[PDB]
Design a protein around this motif. Structure first.
Motif, PDB file in Angstrom:
ATOM      1  N   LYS A   1       5.450   2.977   0.821  1.00 45.97           N
ATOM      2  CA  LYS A   1       6.384   3.937   0.245  1.00 45.97           C
ATOM      3  C   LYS A   1       6.614   5.109   1.193  1.00 45.97           C
ATOM      4  CE  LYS A   1       3.417   3.058  -3.619  1.00 45.97           C
ATOM      5  NZ  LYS A   1       3.460   1.577  -3.764  1.00 45.97           N
ATOM      6  N   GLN A   2       5.586   5.453   1.962  1.00 39.35           N
ATOM      7  CA  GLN A   2       5.678   6.555   2.912  1.00 39.35           C
ATOM      8  C   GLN A   2       5.681   6.039   4.347  1.00 39.35           C
ATOM      9  OE1 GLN A   2       1.996   8.998   2.717  1.00 39.35           O
ATOM     10  NE2 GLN A   2       1.027   7.140   1.911  1.00 39.35           N
ATOM     11  N   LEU A   3       6.376   4.930   4.569  1.00 40.99           N
ATOM     12  CA  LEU A   3       6.460   4.332   5.898  1.00 40.99           C
ATOM     13  C   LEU A   3       6.800   5.385   6.948  1.00 40.99           C
ATOM     14  CD1 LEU A   3       8.714   1.796   4.238  1.00 40.99           C
ATOM     15  CD2 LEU A   3       6.706   0.897   5.428  1.00 40.99           C
ATOM     16  N   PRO A   4       6.384   5.130   8.197  1.00 41.96           N
ATOM     17  CA  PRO A   4       6.636   6.043   9.316  1.00 41.96           C
ATOM     18  C   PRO A   4       8.108   6.086   9.710  1.00 41.96           C
ATOM     19  CG  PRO A   4       5.667   4.007  10.115  1.00 41.96           C
ATOM     20  CD  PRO A   4       5.637   3.931   8.614  1.00 41.96           C
TER      21      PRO A   4
ATOM     22  N   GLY B   1       7.803   3.417  13.462  1.00 37.05           N
ATOM     23  CA  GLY B   1       7.565   2.132  12.831  1.00 37.05           C
ATOM     24  C   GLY B   1       7.541   0.992  13.830  1.00 37.05           C
TER      25      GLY B   1
ATOM     26  N   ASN C   1      -1.834   4.964  16.779  1.00 41.78           N
ATOM     27  CA  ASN C   1      -3.121   5.366  16.223  1.00 41.78           C
ATOM     28  C   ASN C   1      -3.858   6.302  17.177  1.00 41.78           C
ATOM     29  OD1 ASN C   1      -5.890   4.842  14.673  1.00 41.78           O
ATOM     30  ND2 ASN C   1      -6.210   4.374  16.846  1.00 41.78           N
TER      31      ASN C   1
ATOM     32  N   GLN D   1      -0.939  14.875  13.904  1.00 39.10           N
ATOM     33  CA  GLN D   1      -0.075  14.048  13.069  1.00 39.10           C
ATOM     34  C   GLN D   1       1.308  14.674  12.929  1.00 39.10           C
ATOM     35  OE1 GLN D   1      -3.642  14.803  10.962  1.00 39.10           O
ATOM     36  NE2 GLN D   1      -3.677  14.288  13.147  1.00 39.10           N
TER      37      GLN D   1
ATOM     38  N   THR E   1       0.824  -1.202   0.000  1.00 37.46           N
ATOM     39  CA  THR E   1       0.000   0.000   0.000  1.00 37.46           C
ATOM     40  C   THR E   1       0.862   1.257   0.000  1.00 37.46           C
ATOM     41  OG1 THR E   1      -0.536  -0.946   2.179  1.00 37.46           O
ATOM     42  CG2 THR E   1      -2.380  -0.222   0.799  1.00 37.46           C
ATOM     43  N   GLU E   2       0.214   2.414  -0.090  1.00 34.61           N
ATOM     44  CA  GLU E   2       0.923   3.688  -0.099  1.00 34.61           C
ATOM     45  C   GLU E   2       1.843   3.808   1.112  1.00 34.61           C
ATOM     46  OE1 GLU E   2      -2.304   6.395  -0.254  1.00 34.61           O
ATOM     47  OE2 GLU E   2      -3.282   5.547   1.522  1.00 34.61           O
ATOM     48  N   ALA E   3       1.354   3.361   2.264  1.00 30.87           N
ATOM     49  CA  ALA E   3       2.132   3.417   3.497  1.00 30.87           C
ATOM     50  C   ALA E   3       3.483   2.735   3.324  1.00 30.87           C
ATOM     51  CB  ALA E   3       1.357   2.776   4.639  1.00 30.87           C
TER      52      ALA E   3
END
Length: 179
Positions: free
Chosen positions: A38-41, A46, A54, A61, A34-36
């Motif tokens: 590529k844009q992991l935390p 992480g 959450n 954010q 998923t998009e996440a």
């Protein structure tokens, strides 16, 4: 004699009927590209728990420019009139101040709410940006009460305050760490 010796202890104050709101978010999702992905935390984010990380997103954010300082400075905190040794608070991207277990600082006060306010190292203006979620009493900025739900930049030489707490965050510029 009378045999009377004071202890110097302060009296007690009545309690205030308070409550807490327990939210219940949806279940997790299977692991897929998923998009996440590529844009992991962040590295530390992480690792954070699924319900913990959450629970902090429901309030504020972490922006991209966050955690990107360009100047050397430190933070000073006071306690019972005791000037503690200031230290560069760069161990974390931000710091929450409230009663919520998710906050970075859990205190005890009738003015401090689950989420009073939170500051984040603004890599754009080189200064911690604190914003009030809209508390009752009101958060202070630079040693002066101001509105809420607004960007309260507290650079070096300035001060910070929240609720009826005694602790005060006084920012200041330090010497060149890198030679």
């Amino acid at each position: 004699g009378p045999m009377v010796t004071s202890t110097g202890l302060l009296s007690r104050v009545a309690a205030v009927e308070k409550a807490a709101e327990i939210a219940k978010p949806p279940p997790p999702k299977v692991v897929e590209l998923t998009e996440a992905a590529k844009q992991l935390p962040q590295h530390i984010i992480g690792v954070t728990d699924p319900t913990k990380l959450n629970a902090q997103v429901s309030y504020f954010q972490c922006p991209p420019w966050a955690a990107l300082p360009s100047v050397a400075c430190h933070l000073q905190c006071t306690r019972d009139g005791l000037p503690l040794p200031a230290l560069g608070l760069h161990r974390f991207p931000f710091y929450l101040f409230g009663r919520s277990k998710v906050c970075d600082y859990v205190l005890e006060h009738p003015s401090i709410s689950s989420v009073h306010a939170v500051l984040v190292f603004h890599g754009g203006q080189r200064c911690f940006v604190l914003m009030d979620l809209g508390s009752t009493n009101g958060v202070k900025l630079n040693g002066n009460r101001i509105e809420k739900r607004r960007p309260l930049p507290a650079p070096v030489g300035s001060s910070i305050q929240f609720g009826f707490s005694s602790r005060v965050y006084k920012v200041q510029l330090g010497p060149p760490s890198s030679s």
